[PDB]
Design a binder for these strands. Structure first.
Length: 158
DNA sequence: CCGGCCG
DNA sequence: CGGCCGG
């Protein structure tokens, strides 16, 4: 079974002219910061949307952060990095690619890291640091002022 | 294909 | 929304 480090490194978003899609990298970094702060592992869509949307806009180059967050909130399930509760309650669109924003808002499913991954992050902070550093090196190589603080990773990345 | 893009 | 683009 693949390590969390390996699963995170297998996330390879499409590279456009402007750069790779930063959606998955931003949600993963946020989720690592959440585990490190011992926030609950599963968090509602509404809470996650509200936390992550402005980071998506500021650090992820997205125009609409809400519209932005919904893509990795679902797509990370396929990358074996994420769990969405009540998934079978959602309405899918676009040939099964994704849930509608309307059904995400209505059902307000909880989601987050897999239990084994979340438990690893809390128990082995060195493993959290290396996973978050890996994402930062690959996608935020010019490291924006504010990024570590805004993702909750300042103390972690000592 | 399948995850972001864009009529 | 949901079909489209293209890495």
């Amino acid at each position: 079974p693949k390590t969390f480090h390996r699963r995170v490194g297998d996330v390879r978003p499409a590279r456009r002219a402007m750069g790779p899609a930063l959606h998955r990298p931003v949600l993963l970094l946020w989720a690592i910061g959440q585990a490190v702060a011992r926030a609950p592992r599963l968090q509602p869509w509404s809470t996650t949307r509200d936390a992550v949307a402005p980071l998506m806009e500021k650090y992820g180059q997205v125009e609409d952060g809400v519209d932005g967050v919904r893509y990795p909130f679902w797509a990370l399930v396929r990358d074996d990095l994420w769990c969405v509760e009540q998934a079978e309650e959602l309405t899918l669109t676009s040939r099964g690619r994704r849930p509608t924003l309307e059904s995400l808002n209505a059902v307000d499913p909880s989601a987050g890291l897999r239990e084994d991954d979340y438990n690893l992050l809390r128990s082995q902070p060195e493993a959290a640091a290396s996973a978050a550093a890996g994402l930062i090196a690959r996608y935020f190589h010019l490291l924006p002022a504010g990024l570590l603080e805004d993702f909750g990773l300042h103390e972690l990345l000592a």
